[PDB]
Ligand binder design. Sequence first.
Ligand code: NAP
Ligand code: WPJ
Ligand code: BR
Ligand code: BR
Ligand code: CL
Length: 158
Amino acid sequence: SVGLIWAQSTSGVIGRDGGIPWRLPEDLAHFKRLTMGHTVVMGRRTWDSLPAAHRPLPGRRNVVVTRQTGLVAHGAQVVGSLEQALSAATWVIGGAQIYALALPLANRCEVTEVDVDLPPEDEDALAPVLDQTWAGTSGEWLVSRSGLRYRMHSYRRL
Ligand SMILES: NC(=O)c1ccc[n+]([C@@H]2O[C@H](COP(=O)([O-])OP(=O)(O)OC[C@H]3O[C@@H](n4cnc5c(N)ncnc54)[C@H](OP(=O)(O)O)[C@@H]3O)[C@@H](O)[C@H]2O)c1
Ligand SMILES: CCc1nc(N)nc(N)c1OCCCOc1cccc(C[C@H](C(=O)O)C(F)F)c1
Ligand SMILES: [Br-]
Ligand SMILES: [Br-]
Ligand SMILES: [Cl-]
């Protein structure tokens, strides 16, 4: 059982300049609630992107995928491939390169869509594209306490 979870702008951007280009508290609560107690699998750049006070992610087995040798990610397990990372319920938490690896092995995608306008720039990290082999159910557009509009989508593999 492999699930992907990500937050994207409407245009499909998930990352810019080594971080996430918006702040959405309700998404962090959603992310924490869905991943707590499970293994979280991430690419090395995404590990690097975690704020120090949240690295490693507490209450979850953190697995970092890299091509480096002897990489030290304190409090995490370091592996050399996605297959190694996956040997109950496992969540792949980004970024774009690791999503692209994990999508064919996944039965579930949990997407937060953030209604901000961010035209993709050259080096952006982009969300994977889901076709009609995926069955989605969406919540309503909601307004965060901070004022940003967002909505949750849950996709299962048909
Ligand atoms: N909005 C969201 O939901 C979300 C979620 C996660 C991350 N992000 C953002 O996305 C960006 C990071 O994503 P990214 O696509 O640049 O990077 P990434 O997928 O997190 O990590 C890329 C790294 O993964 C390793 N890697 C890639 N393919 C591999 C393979 N086949 N075997 C072994 N290791 C492999 C390499 O590590 P080495 O270079 O060490 O060899 C590579 O540099 C940041 O901006 C981050 O903030 C956003
Ligand atoms: C949280 C952004 C996000 N959103 C969805 N939907 N999917 C994702 N893959 C995703 O990026 C995961 C990589 C970044 O991760 C975090 C960075 C800072 C804080 C937290 C939450 C933290 C925790 O979880 O303890 C606590 F503050 F709540 C996660
Ligand atoms: Br963030
Ligand atoms: Br926040
Ligand atoms: Cl979407």
